Amino acid sequence: NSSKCYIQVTGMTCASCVANIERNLRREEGIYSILVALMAGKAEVRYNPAVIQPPMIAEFIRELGFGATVIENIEGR
């Protein structure tokens, strides 16, 4: 079933961006949860990688939004 990946957006607390991004994503294209975690300062989309593609789901966010660095991992303290 649908898995997730993390994505760092170049300007999380721009604001509005994220409302738009919910509107972009929850439309369609293999998503079964949107990213957002602007509260921390990042994105975590839950999707299927077959329809859209892991590069593609990140990459798309560049052209309409902002620099979207993909992170198929999470670690820190």
Interface with Cu ion includes 1 (CB under 5 A)? Answer: no
Question: Helix H segments across 1-77?
Answer: 17-25, 54-64
Looking at the Cβ atoms of 19 and 74, the one nearer to Cu ion is: 19
17 annotated to a ligand binding site: yes
> What secondary structure letter does DSSP report for 6?
E
Site for Cu ion in 3-42 (CB under 5 A): 14, 16-17
Residue ranges of the binding site for Cu(+) = 14, 17
- In the complex, which residues of this chain contact Cu ion (CB under 5 A)? 14, 16-17
